[PDB]
Design an enzyme around this catalytic site. Structure first.
Site, short mmCIF file in Angstrom:
data_model
loop_
_atom_site.label_atom_id
_atom_site.label_comp_id
_atom_site.label_asym_id
_atom_site.label_seq_id
_atom_site.Cartn_x
_atom_site.Cartn_y
_atom_site.Cartn_z
N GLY A 161 49.90 1.70 34.61
CA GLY A 161 48.55 1.43 34.06
C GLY A 161 48.66 0.46 33.70
O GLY A 161 48.77 0.26 32.93
N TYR A 202 42.33 -0.98 31.19
CA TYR A 202 41.96 -1.27 29.73
C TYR A 202 43.41 -0.67 28.46
O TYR A 202 43.27 -1.03 27.26
CB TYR A 202 40.67 -1.08 29.24
CG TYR A 202 39.56 -2.54 29.27
CD1 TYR A 202 38.80 -2.97 30.23
CD2 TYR A 202 39.62 -2.83 27.79
CE1 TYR A 202 38.46 -3.60 29.69
CE2 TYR A 202 38.51 -4.17 27.46
CZ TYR A 202 38.06 -4.56 28.17
OH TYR A 202 37.47 -5.50 27.97
N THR A 204 36.58 12.43 35.81
CA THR A 204 35.57 12.97 35.91
C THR A 204 35.55 13.36 37.09
O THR A 204 35.39 12.83 38.32
CB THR A 204 34.58 12.80 35.44
OG1 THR A 204 33.78 12.00 33.78
CG2 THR A 204 33.76 13.32 35.06
N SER A 246 45.25 8.28 27.66
CA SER A 246 44.06 8.30 27.72
C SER A 246 44.03 9.63 26.90
O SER A 246 42.59 9.79 26.50
CB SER A 246 43.85 8.67 29.58
OG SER A 246 44.04 7.36 30.05
N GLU A 297 43.47 5.23 22.65
CA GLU A 297 43.65 4.69 22.24
C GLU A 297 41.53 4.06 21.52
O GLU A 297 40.92 4.53 22.48
CB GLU A 297 43.69 3.07 23.14
CG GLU A 297 44.57 2.64 22.98
CD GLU A 297 45.07 1.73 22.05
OE1 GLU A 297 44.09 1.45 21.45
OE2 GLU A 297 46.50 1.77 21.64
N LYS A 350 40.13 12.09 19.74
CA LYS A 350 39.91 11.10 20.52
C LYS A 350 38.06 11.04 20.87
O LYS A 350 37.59 10.28 20.70
CB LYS A 350 40.48 10.47 21.92
CG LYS A 350 39.75 10.04 22.82
CD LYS A 350 39.49 7.93 22.39
CE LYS A 350 39.90 7.67 23.57
NZ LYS A 350 38.60 6.45 23.42
N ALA A 397 36.83 13.95 19.87
CA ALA A 397 35.56 14.15 18.64
C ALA A 397 34.91 13.07 17.94
O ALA A 397 33.89 13.05 17.70
CB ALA A 397 36.09 15.33 17.33
N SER A 443 17.24 3.80 18.80
CA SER A 443 16.82 2.90 20.31
C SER A 443 16.29 4.14 21.54
O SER A 443 16.13 5.47 21.18
CB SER A 443 18.09 3.02 21.19
OG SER A 443 19.00 3.84 21.02
N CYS A 452 31.39 6.10 27.92
CA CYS A 452 32.35 6.34 27.00
C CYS A 452 31.93 7.52 25.84
O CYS A 452 32.63 9.03 25.83
CB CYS A 452 33.01 5.83 25.83
SG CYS A 452 34.02 4.66 25.87
N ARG A 509 13.90 -1.33 21.71
CA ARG A 509 15.14 -1.87 20.45
C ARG A 509 15.18 -1.74 19.35
O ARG A 509 15.72 -2.19 18.38
CB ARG A 509 15.69 -2.44 21.30
CG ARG A 509 16.89 -1.91 22.63
CD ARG A 509 17.66 -1.32 22.45
NE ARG A 509 18.28 -0.77 23.93
CZ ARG A 509 19.47 0.02 23.95
NH1 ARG A 509 20.07 0.76 23.41
NH2 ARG A 509 19.65 0.40 25.13
#
Lengths: 458, 458, 458
Positions: free
Chosen positions: C10, C13, C92, C129, C159, C218, C220, C267, C274, C434
């Site tokens: 892979g 990123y 997804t 991942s 990550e 990750k 949570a 906001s 994410c 904002r």
């Protein structure tokens, strides 16, 4: 190896009649029924048994004191037994989780512990009420309290008898079911109990499963039977709306051998202490196991029963223009079914309750149910104001607006209806909740009765 | 005395029934009529348009003597003593009751044709028996009377199962005949009985009103469907507790009040009879403001739908919720073994769920033609991209992640699973939706398979 | 024993920047990044990397061709590696169960299989991942396809980097998290990977858990961050109704050290690729595991985000008297946050979508997002009719009824508002999503603007 001594903990319906039959059929086996209840034990040792069953007195007395013993000494009977039956009450929980639905394992667990304390070497322990988890519970307790040279085997052996015909059912069962582990130990044990039953029961009719299956079988059997009744009851509402007749439909249905003709008599609602309890317990079990689809599937059997009772009551109340205050109404039949004194979950209680909510003056007749039982069932002041227990059916009907037949006692077919009509207020209604008056409809209508029945359009 | 019979509709209902009547009553002239000329020609060929064992012999035994197939409806009605209406009652595709209500358009048109062509006395008997058919015909006859025209309306449902039509027609469990509870109806019923009594004993003939005969056919199938749903609901419970559904069904079944038929757990019930009949029953309850009864029966459908989904979702979960570009063997496409009929087959629904996951399905069935498998899966590109129809089970299992058994064909019991395993990707899965592989689990587990099945805890 | 060669499957990123840093910090380790995508690999070997990150070009070029290699040869790199990272997309699901919520494990599984085929002796395999079940899935595949002398260890190493600051984050992490079995084998493996990280990272910041915990951590972490934003957003609606001010409240809240002052800026709604993805995935996981209470708890974080966007849009539309047909509106900011070109799940898309539903003429400005990206985001003819992409902010505002600030780009503070006002239709609205214009409120109001902002009463 061989079963020569048997201890039965519990001297009720579950264990009294079964062990009496075992000692009548197997002369070689010492059978000892034990119970903490002294008055129960003394009744079993008296000439009049605490349980009324046809031919039961004869079965007990042919072997009592020979190889059949009723004793208050639980401890010692356990010590010397090859096989220990556990057949104690498993009453529905009254508080806590599963209140009114779940079964309460407290007596089974207490018996499981007493067994450990009093037990040595090899024994087979067989539970007979078989609620779901009983065997698992007994297993957990045995495993956590072991001893050197202690080897207890756990089996499950549900009773399928119906009260009234216990002995015939015990001597001639459709099947005997024994559940045990799929282990070489568990097999050893299932064989031992089989060999006991084979004294009067062919191997063809003896079925061996796992402990979980025997537990679920008992429950599911009673659920299927109850479902059949609600199914034909649902049809009865549809017949009333269409002009079909539920007795014609049920007969047509039943002649399909894939279906069979049993448990297809439409009624005001099923009762007895087995069906609602077992369906409610099955529903609870599905909710607790995250099976909500299965739970709502089985809940319908209960909801249909409830709906059938309510719409029956509602039809009576509407025929009376929604006013029943101070009107006399005859309730004929209080037993949950005919030919018994048992009123548990009887449909008559419910119909009565609905009419009492309307301020009806209920005159209640039943040839077998005691007055005392009826009073207790309707109570929980309202009873004192509204409920008369009638000595005879004619007394119940004298000056009544309506006659409500709630139990299918044969005598109701053969009452003098022309006399009853004369003494009733007019319009005189007859509401037949059991199809007990089928065939008399033309005669009653010419007499002047407005006569209505389940599953028949007005 | 009935001596001339006309049957409008040369389908499954009319063709076989009237052939049998003619083969049993040499003295009765029986004329099967249909507007479709090519079908009539086929009944008059050595290749009948219906494939039933025994049917060709019955037809040829009496065709030309006293059995006739003709395109001339009008002259066949004019002369007939008795007129059977045996036309299709398709489910409505639009409008009120879309997908659930039966469409009475062909029955009405026949009723109008019969009046146009009839004088004197005739008995008219509806054979498809959807609810309200009898009332409908009666409304057309009553509004279109002629001087000296006296039509009697009877209802007489067929109960045959395709595959054993002749056996079921020569020895029915029962014959049902509905008619008005009047002297006219009684006479008309009697005449039809007399016809059936040439081969059917009078004990097996049941007479009812016409509403009851309609409700009975609907109700019987619902009851059958409900049993399978009830046992399927138990199967989920067994999977959660460690009970076994075959053990439980066998215990339930040996209760003579329940009987042992229709108690086999499966991935779901199929066929052209059950969902259609239960859905129509639900619809009729809603329309008659019986919502309680409607949701009671709806549960039979919801449970079937739930059993299929949880089977699929168990497959999908075992493959970690990704089936994209994964080869899966589907073994069996027919709704049951020993037939080529795919109507409401559970295979259709399982295939559908896996296709939503992008599965590469390789489908094998020894009797269902490849064009029927394609056409069923195309019902409203997915079929084009994802579906292959194999010609042997080994080509279907070659390189697959999973083997799904959806139809209980006997040949699946006897495949070389050691062979199949070696060519499958690992871990290799068998999902047995019919309990076809019972008894073999330890063989397959030791070969290397993860083997799962309905009604058995993993 | 010791890790000397590393394969990364892979080159995105997840694995590009991480392995570049590893080869920059550990001169002794041969690091080989592999990918099936040839155009991606050729870009990594070019002077311009396929990923824009500050200082990334320098990190790669200081070791590329020395001990850092980008190769299209996956097979061989696996063969010779002590340690194999799996860091491939886990998009997804787009169809099937968990559509739009669940993560798709297909690439992880395909990499797991390629590893088995190409692998000998001892190797450590670490997935990066870390969706829930990834490690379990890889474990199932390894266990089912074993070989003599094949010993694959499975670890999890999520990550936590944020795009834009990848390198700083990689050189200076808050923590490094490695998950592995609580076995003497698993411990052996966790130590090996620790020793790699300890080249630039203190042991104090390296945390070892089980594989399930690293996966859930990750997820949570991102859920808690998203919750913080929705919490302060919920408060912002309450400030608008009461006269409290969400910036005062947030500052008061943040000065409690038990809470801390990060992620408390109210906001128009959180975005990026994410947060919504991770909260939706967490919800799905709870539904699938029969934890509906936990699922509905986390769903609120999403529902609050959705509600915050909708009520903002709704306030604009109401200020315009519920008619926005053919009215020009300036959208300032399209990036999901300032200082980036990323528009994934940007709140501007949603606000834009709502105004386009009203037939607004949108003139959209953003200093970094390309015109092409904006067009694609709003599309799915409506865009052609209603959307203009403005070269400059003044062009966007010229003759607008309203100015809607959707992204917190610093330049928006410093536009010439007196000029903007002159060229706008009146009443001229400014809607600050904002709090970017805080402190300018008095000046804008005297200029003549009707100015509104999140978390401030009108």
């Amino acid at each position: 190896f061989e079963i020569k001594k048997i201890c039965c903990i519990g001297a009720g319906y579950v264990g009294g009649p079964t062990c009496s039959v075992i000692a009548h059929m197997c002369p070689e086996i010492r059978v000892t029924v034990v119970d903490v209840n002294e008055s129960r034990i003394n009744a079993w040792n008296s000439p009049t048994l605490p349980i009324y069953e046809p031919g039961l007195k004869e079965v007990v007395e042919s072997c009592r004191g020979k190889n059949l013993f009723f004793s208050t000494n639980i401890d010692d009977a356990i010590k010397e037994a090859d096989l220990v039956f556990i057949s104690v009450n498993t009453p529905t929980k009254t508080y806590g989780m599963g209140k009114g639905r779940a079964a309460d394992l407290k007596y089974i667990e207490a018996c499981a512990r007493r067994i450990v304390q009093n037990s040595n070497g090899y024994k087979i322990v067989t539970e007979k009420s078989t609620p779901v988890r009983a065997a698992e519970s007994i297993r957990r307790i045995f495993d956590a309290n072991t001893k050197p040279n202690l080897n207890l085997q756990v089996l499950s052996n549900p009773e399928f008898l119906a009260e009234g015909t216990a002995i015939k059912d015990l001597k001639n069962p459709d099947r005997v079911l024994i559940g045990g582990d799929e282990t070489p130990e568990g097999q050893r044990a299932v064989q031992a109990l089989c060999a006991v039953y084979e004294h009067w029961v062919p191997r063809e009719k003896i079925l061996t499963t796992n402990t979980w299956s025997s537990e679920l079988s008992k429950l599911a059997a009673n659920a299927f039977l109850a479902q059949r009744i609600s199914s034909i009851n649902s049809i009865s509402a549809l017949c009333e709306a269409t002009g079909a007749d539920v007795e014609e439909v049920a007969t047509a249905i039943g002649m399909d051998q894939r279906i069979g003709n049993k448990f297809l008599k439409a009624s005001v609602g099923f009762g007895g202490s087995c069906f609602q309890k077992d369906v409610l317990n099955l529903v609870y079990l599905c909710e607790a196991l995250n099976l909500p689809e299965v739970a709502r599937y089985w809940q319908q059997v209960i909801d249909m029963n409830d709906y059938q009772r309510r719409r029956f009551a509602s039809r009576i109340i509407d025929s009376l223009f929604n006013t029943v205050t101070d009107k006399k109404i005859a309730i004929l039949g209080f037993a949950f079914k005919k030919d018994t004194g048992d009123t548990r979950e009887s449909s008559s209680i419910y119909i009565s309750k609905y009419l009492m909510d309307e301020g009806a003056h209920l005159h209640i007749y039943d040839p077998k149910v005691p007055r005392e039982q009826i009073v207790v069932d309707l109570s929980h002041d309202q009873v004192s104001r509204l409920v008369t227990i009638s000595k005879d059916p004619y007394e119940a009907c004298d000056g009544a607006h309506a006659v409500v037949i709630c139990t299918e006692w044969d005598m109701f077919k053969e009452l003098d209806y022309e006399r009853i009509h004369k003494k009733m207020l007019k319009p005189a209604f007859i509401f037949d909740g059991r199809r007990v008056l089928d065939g008399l409809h033309n005669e009653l209508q010419t007499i002047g009765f407005q006569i209505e029945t389940i599953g028949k359009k007005v």
